[PDB]
Amino acid sequence: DIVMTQSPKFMSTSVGDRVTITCKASQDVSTAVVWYQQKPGQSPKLLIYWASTRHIGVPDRFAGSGSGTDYTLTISSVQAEDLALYYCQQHYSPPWTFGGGTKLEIK
Amino acid sequence: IREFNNLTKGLCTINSWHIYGKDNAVRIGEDSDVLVTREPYVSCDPDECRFYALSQGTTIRGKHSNGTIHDRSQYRDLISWPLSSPPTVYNSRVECIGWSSTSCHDGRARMSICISGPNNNASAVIWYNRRPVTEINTWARNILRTQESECVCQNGVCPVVFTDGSATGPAETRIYYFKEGKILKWEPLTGTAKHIEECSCYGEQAGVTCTCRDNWQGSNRPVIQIDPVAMTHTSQYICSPVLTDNPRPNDPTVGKCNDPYPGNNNNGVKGFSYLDGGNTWLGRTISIASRSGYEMLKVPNALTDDRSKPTQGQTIVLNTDWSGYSGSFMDYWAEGECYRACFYVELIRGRPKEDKVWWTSNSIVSMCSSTEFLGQWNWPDGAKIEYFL
Amino acid sequence: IREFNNLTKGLCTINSWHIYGKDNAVRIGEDSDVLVTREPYVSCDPDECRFYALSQGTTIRGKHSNGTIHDRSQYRDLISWPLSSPPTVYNSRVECIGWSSTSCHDGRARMSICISGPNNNASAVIWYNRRPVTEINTWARNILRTQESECVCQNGVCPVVFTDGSATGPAETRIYYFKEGKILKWEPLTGTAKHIEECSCYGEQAGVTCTCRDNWQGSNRPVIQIDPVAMTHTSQYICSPVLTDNPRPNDPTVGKCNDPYPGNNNNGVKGFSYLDGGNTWLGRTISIASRSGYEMLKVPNALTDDRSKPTQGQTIVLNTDWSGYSGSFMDYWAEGECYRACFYVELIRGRPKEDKVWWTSNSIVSMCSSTEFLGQWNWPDGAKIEYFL
Amino acid sequence: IREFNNLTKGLCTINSWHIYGKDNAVRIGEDSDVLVTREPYVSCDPDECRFYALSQGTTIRGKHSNGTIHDRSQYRDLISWPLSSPPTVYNSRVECIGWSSTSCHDGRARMSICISGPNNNASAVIWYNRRPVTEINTWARNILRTQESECVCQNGVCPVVFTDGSATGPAETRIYYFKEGKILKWEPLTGTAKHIEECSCYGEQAGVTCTCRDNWQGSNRPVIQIDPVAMTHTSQYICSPVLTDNPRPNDPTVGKCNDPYPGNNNNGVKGFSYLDGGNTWLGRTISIASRSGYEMLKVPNALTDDRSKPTQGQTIVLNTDWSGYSGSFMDYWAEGECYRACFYVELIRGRPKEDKVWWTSNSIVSMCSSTEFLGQWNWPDGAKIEYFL
Ligand SMILES: *[C@@H]1O[C@H](CO)[C@@H](O[C@@H]2O[C@H](CO)[C@@H](O[C@@H]3O[C@H](CO)[C@@H](O)[C@H](O[C@H]4O[C@H](CO)[C@@H](O)[C@H](O)[C@@H]4O[C@H]4O[C@H](CO)[C@@H](O)[C@H](O)[C@@H]4O[C@H]4O[C@H](CO)[C@@H](O)[C@H](O)[C@@H]4O)[C@@H]3O)[C@H](O)[C@H]2NC(C)=O)[C@H](O)[C@H]1NC(C)=O
Ligand SMILES: *[C@@H]1O[C@H](CO)[C@@H](O[C@@H]2O[C@H](CO)[C@@H](O[C@@H]3O[C@H](CO)[C@@H](O)[C@H](O[C@H]4O[C@H](CO)[C@@H](O)[C@H](O)[C@@H]4O[C@H]4O[C@H](CO)[C@@H](O)[C@H](O)[C@@H]4O[C@H]4O[C@H](CO)[C@@H](O)[C@H](O)[C@@H]4O)[C@@H]3O)[C@H](O)[C@H]2NC(C)=O)[C@H](O)[C@H]1NC(C)=O
Ligand SMILES: *[C@@H]1O[C@H](CO)[C@@H](O[C@@H]2O[C@H](CO)[C@@H](O[C@@H]3O[C@H](CO)[C@@H](O)[C@H](O[C@H]4O[C@H](CO)[C@@H](O)[C@H](O)[C@@H]4O[C@H]4O[C@H](CO)[C@@H](O)[C@H](O)[C@@H]4O[C@H]4O[C@H](CO)[C@@H](O)[C@H](O)[C@@H]4O)[C@@H]3O)[C@H](O)[C@H]2NC(C)=O)[C@H](O)[C@H]1NC(C)=O
Ligand SMILES: *[C@@H]1O[C@H](CO)[C@@H](O[C@@H]2O[C@H](CO)[C@@H](O)[C@H](O)[C@H]2NC(C)=O)[C@H](O)[C@H]1NC(C)=O
Ligand SMILES: *[C@@H]1O[C@H](CO)[C@@H](O[C@@H]2O[C@H](CO)[C@@H](O)[C@H](O)[C@H]2NC(C)=O)[C@H](O)[C@H]1NC(C)=O
Ligand SMILES: *[C@@H]1O[C@H](CO)[C@@H](O[C@@H]2O[C@H](CO)[C@@H](O)[C@H](O)[C@H]2NC(C)=O)[C@H](O)[C@H]1NC(C)=O
Ligand SMILES: *[C@@H]1O[C@H](CO)[C@@H](O)[C@H](O)[C@H]1NC(C)=O
Ligand SMILES: *[C@@H]1O[C@H](CO)[C@@H](O)[C@H](O)[C@H]1NC(C)=O
Ligand SMILES: *[C@@H]1O[C@H](CO)[C@@H](O)[C@H](O)[C@H]1NC(C)=O
Ligand SMILES: [Ca+2]
Numbered sequence A: 001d002i003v004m005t006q007s008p009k010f011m012s013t014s015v016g017d018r019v020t021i022t023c024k025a026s027q028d029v030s031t032a033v034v035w036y037q038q039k040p041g042q043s044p045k046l047l048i049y050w051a052s053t054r055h056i057g058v059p060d061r062f063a064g065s066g067s068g069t070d071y072t073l074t075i076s077s078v079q080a081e082d083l084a085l086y087y088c089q090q091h092y093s094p095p096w097t098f099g100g101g102t103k104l105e106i107k
Numbered sequence B, C, D: 001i002r003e004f005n006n007l008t009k010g011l012c013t014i015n016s017w018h019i020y021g022k023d024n025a026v027r028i029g030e031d032s033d034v035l036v037t038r039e040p041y042v043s044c045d046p047d048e049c050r051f052y053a054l055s056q057g058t059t060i061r062g063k064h065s066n067g068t069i070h071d072r073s074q075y076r077d078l079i080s081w082p083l084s085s086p087p088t089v090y091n092s093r094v095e096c097i098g099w100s101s102t103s104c105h106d107g108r109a110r111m112s113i114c115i116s117g118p119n120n121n122a123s124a125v126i127w128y129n130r131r132p133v134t135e136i137n138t139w140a141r142n143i144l145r146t147q148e149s150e151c152v153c154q155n156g157v158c159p160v161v162f163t164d165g166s167a168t169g170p171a172e173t174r175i176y177y178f179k180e181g182k183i184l185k186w187e188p189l190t191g192t193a194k195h196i197e198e199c200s201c202y203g204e205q206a207g208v209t210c211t212c213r214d215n216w217q218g219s220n221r222p223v224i225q226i227d228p229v230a231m232t233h234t235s236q237y238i239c240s241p242v243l244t245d246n247p248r249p250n251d252p253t254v255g256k257c258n259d260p261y262p263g264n265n266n267n268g269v270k271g272f273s274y275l276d277g278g279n280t281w282l283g284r285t286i287s288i289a290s291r292s293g294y295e296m297l298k299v300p301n302a303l304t305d306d307r308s309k310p311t312q313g314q315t316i317v318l319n320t321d322w323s324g325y326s327g328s329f330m331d332y333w334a335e336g337e338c339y340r341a342c343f344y345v346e347l348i349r350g351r352p353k354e355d356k357v358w359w360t361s362n363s364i365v366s367m368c369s370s371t372e373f374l375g376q377w378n379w380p381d382g383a384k385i386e387y388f389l
């Protein structure tokens, strides 16, 4: 199984700034990385797939990236409603393995 | 025929699609000496149509099957065998040696082209009438590759699309013009197309159209039209919002004809389209992210319109089944008023998505068009990855 | 031949039957790559005779063999291979794709017809000279089916019997007339026949006779005579008390020519007969309830007489052995004063009756007639269901 | 052709080498019915090129594969099969029976020659047009042997080099001249060459050149030129310090043209060379002691100069991979201004060096020349001796 490791677990950024969430796999997963966002007390929304392609209607603030075993999700002009638990799933081989999440707190 | 062929006719009305061939290779392959292959295609002689594919030089059960994810190796061989049989050890015909290829009959004999090599010292040898006639070497030294479909010939001239260079950058594409295996001319890519890979070509009315893959930025395909009479070409993207590469962003409402449609970069999967005004049909995988499902959608004036949405469709492979590469082929020697339009879909099985086995492989489905509006079925490879364990 | 064929001759005197072919497929199949098939038949080119059958796309040993009881699937393919060989992966010729079929040579090239589909959106494509020429779609949307024997051609015109509709009700049968793959005419069933299925046809003297199956109420077969010159037909039942469908009630003393003979409904098994006055021979399974045994009985003026009991017979398969489908074929290009009359019997092995294996399959026996009164043998498939365990 | 062939053309400029064929037999052979062979070669009909080899009469997996180190046995058979397929049980064509052979097409039909026998009572039968025409018996009673490459024909006359005698002493070589299977003349070896074995021959400009093996003292090859028009020949050694037999002493700075170059005696491995002045290419194993690696080196005026060191090279098989026998072949019926120069390398696998299996066997690589200076790859047999355990 491929193993997605998310560190750090908590992130604080101020309203209007940048944050970036780092995800990493245990072998070259050849860019097959998806990012979900889980809003508190809601279901996940798929933001990005294939490391950087946005799903239908996640506004361009969210910028997926990466390569090999190291990927990252950047968010800009951080909104007080950006608070959520962010997870990377991988989508190269079965079974589709997630990360631990990162809570983005608003300073 | 005893004479070269001229593409005198035009396409017939595509109104639905009918099954033309299905080899069932992995299903049979669990117990016969079916060869591991990938990148298939189909091509017609004036006398018969055969399935062609890039062999990996091992049977699917054989222990050397493990690790066939690798595209290029020196155990790759371009083979052919009868229409709708499996690539069997005891009936494939090896056409030339290499890991990239195109093949097509000019009316008299056929040309096969197999590229072989180290990734920085690759070399093509242009076989004509089963004899090695010409050889071209790498101009940009980073993987010299060609079509993985059949080329079309006209009056002896068969244009062929070769790309050497980066699949991640600008590459160095070039159209070559063969007549009887010799190089008549070769010219560099021109047009608004940013990067060309794995071109799918059909010929009608003395013009050949190729629908390719932009690996770099495209999610909308580059179309190259080539004029085999004057040995000239141009390229553009397909204007339609209906995006056909895979992966892709979800289709816009307005598409893009003179630049890549921005979204999924450094990736694609070979494909085709029949581009003919009202009678345009585009093929695409259903998944925006994976080679699963295949469908044919009629999108009138797709090539030229930045607003063309579909008006009729047909399902070929369900989204719950796997697909892969697709390309165009036609029987130029089929007696008619017109050219029957056909395509094939490769059905990948194995690694990476079914990694419980260590081999990758495929079977083939192919359709041709009918003017009747026939009913549709959906055509699964069919094997159970669990009986190979 | 380089010219179309006219059925100029008439049958020869049937006086006994001699073995023409026996493939021994399941027996060999325990150790070679013999294909799982069912619904076989035989057809002759002007140059050679071959065995044709509907493949299930798996070897009998292969693990995908399990579950081949199902008649229709998209892994079915109509194949042919040499007379008296097994359907081998490495020598069958795939003729078209689908789960119903007919095929026959018009003298010049041959027509093959394979129906494919969902049960409510089925489609036939009429291949001529190994190229797809025409396609007809479902008129009644509940399983479009055709012969599972060979069709007969005359002067280019080959009538073909198609039934779409219910196998339990009124269905919607129709005779189609092909010349060179194109549809010359098509007309609805007519005559007193209540329901037509799986017609067996032979041609003599410029008329083609089909002996079919009434699934619905018949236990006596519908006979359709077709006139390929004027493209007309009529249907009736066979008058004889000698009932030939299976299952059936036990034979009466007076039979029925203008209605089904009442008794076993919603069921039958494909069959044939040579209908020629004094020289009429009917084939039937021996069991009134199961496809076991096969015999040929001479019942003079069977077609026209409600009292015709047999006068000579011959045993083909014992009642302790299994049989199945049967149909007529002839070598129209066999040099003679007359047409040698032949038939084939399919020999089913597997599920449901031998359910210790999970595959169904079959072999073939075929006979032609002799005027000598030869001795008889009885011709078992031959395999032991216990060596496959 | 319908007419005999005259070697009218001369060689083309050898500037690099391109892959012509690769059968991948041991790799496939782990799971198909690939035959155990050894001593391969290639030969061209006016209509097609095929791979020929000496079969050992067993499949590589079959249990009789064990012990195929032995060169001669009565289960040896000279076979042929299509270019770049494996020697498969179901598609090899047996050419004659024996353990030594040559074969070649004279333009009309082909001659095959298989020697069979006890080592002291051996007999050759010269088949022409697949019928046994002539037979020659042992003159020196200690293993009668011939080429293990193809012979060249000119105007019906095909010279063939036969050696009976000791492989450790003086043997008794003799050039025979066949026309249409009959013996036109035969003459004894002449020239400064001390001992001839396994001659490799190509024809150009109505002269045939053979590059052989001196088993006895040579580490530099004997070259025989034969004049097929006058039925005369001479022999000499190759002057170059570049030693090409295997084993060999390490190359001197001055070589030897009229005597064996002293160093490794009672041993060698069959080989070839294209001898043409500036355009001379010699092939050799890389190891001075073992059949591993194969390379082609251009050594101008090699034949005539005792100081010729190489000026361009190409790697065919790496030194970490195994090689074996090599020889020349050409397509005399290939349309050109000139003769394309080709060679094959046999790739031995098994005993004695990979004795974890009990069979010896091989696959084939073949190249032809290109005038372009193409890039090089290195072409491994490819199987893992560990999957056969
Ligand atoms: C007997 O057989 C006949 C003959 O085949 C049957 O009739 C045919 O039935 C077909 C399916 O019912 C029918 O196809 C449909 O045709 C319409 C035109 O009216 C066409 O729009 C449809 O195509 C869209 O929908 C399919 C799924 O339904 C999508 O997979 C496809 O991609 C098309 O939609 C996507 O792209 C559009 C264009 O940009 C967008 O507008 C749309 O929002 C959608 O977007 C998403 O999907 C994309 C791919 O997943 C993705 O990239 C994108 O980003 C979005 O996520 C469809 O083909 C035939 O027209 C009809 N033919 C005939 C002759 O009648 C008959 O029903 C059968 N009878 C029975 C009883 O079974
Ligand atoms: C050497 O070889 C030669 C050449 O083959 C041998 O001679 C042949 O031998 C045959 C068998 O001995 C012989 O066949 C018989 O011919 C008579 C005519 O005289 C014919 O009646 C027979 O057919 C009936 O009987 C068989 C069993 O014997 C039944 O299976 C068959 O169905 C026929 O009977 C059924 O239908 C009849 C018609 O309606 C009814 O009247 C009858 O009651 C019976 O009814 C039941 O059976 C049905 C099916 O099971 C069922 O539907 C129904 O409801 C009832 O339940 C038989 O074919 C050949 O005529 C003869 N030929 C020649 C040229 O001589 C020779 O003996 C061999 N020599 C040696 C030494 O071995
Ligand atoms: C893309 O592809 C192209 C096209 O192929 C590449 O260019 C080619 O590259 C080749 C290798 O780089 C090059 O070959 C070399 O050519 C020189 C001539 O300048 C030739 O001397 C070389 O041959 C000797 O060296 C090899 C190993 O390098 C030996 O294995 C060989 O036997 C030759 O040396 C031995 O014999 C000589 C003659 O007597 C002695 O002088 C020498 O001391 C040596 O002796 C030992 O070795 C013997 C065998 O092991 C043994 O018997 C003896 O006793 C001693 O122990 C070599 O072939 C091509 O010329 C070149 N061609 C072209 C058209 O450019 C290009 O590099 C590729 N590009 C990339 C980016 O990869
Ligand atoms: C070939 O297939 C074998 C299985 O047949 C693969 O074996 C695994 O390989 C890894 C190293 O990659 C070993 O550590 C595992 O223990 C093996 N186990 C299993 C269950 O497969 C092998 O890697 C495959 N690949 C190649 C190129 O040989
Ligand atoms: C395929 O064959 C297998 C045996 O190879 C069948 O397996 C049985 O299936 C039932 C369910 O139908 C299981 O509960 C049994 O335990 C299985 N056991 C045995 C002894 O066969 C399987 O059903 C077959 N059918 C298909 C369509 O796969
Ligand atoms: C044939 O192969 C077998 C193995 O399949 C060889 O068997 C060995 O033979 C020796 C005698 O030469 C025995 O003492 C060994 O115990 C055998 N063991 C093993 C592990 O192979 C046999 O020699 C081979 N040779 C022939 C000609 O039959
Ligand atoms: C084919 O087309 C060329 C022009 O493209 C024409 O000159 C030639 O004669 C044509 N030949 C045939 C058989 O149509
Ligand atoms: C075949 O029969 C038709 C009438 O059915 C006749 O006109 C035609 O000429 C015949 N041809 C041959 C070769 O018998
Ligand atoms: C072949 O060559 C001989 C002389 O070697 C000559 O007499 C003969 O006529 C030639 N034939 C052909 C077709 O060249
Ligand atoms: Ca792309």
Ligand SMILES: [Ca+2]
Residues within 6 Å of the ligand: C214, C215, C216, C217, C218, C219, C245, C247, C264, C265, C266, C267, C268
């Ligand atoms: Ca009934």
Ligand SMILES: [Ca+2]
Residues within 6 Å of the ligand: D214, D215, D216, D217, D218, D219, D245, D247, D264, D265, D266, D267, D268
């Ligand atoms: Ca020596």
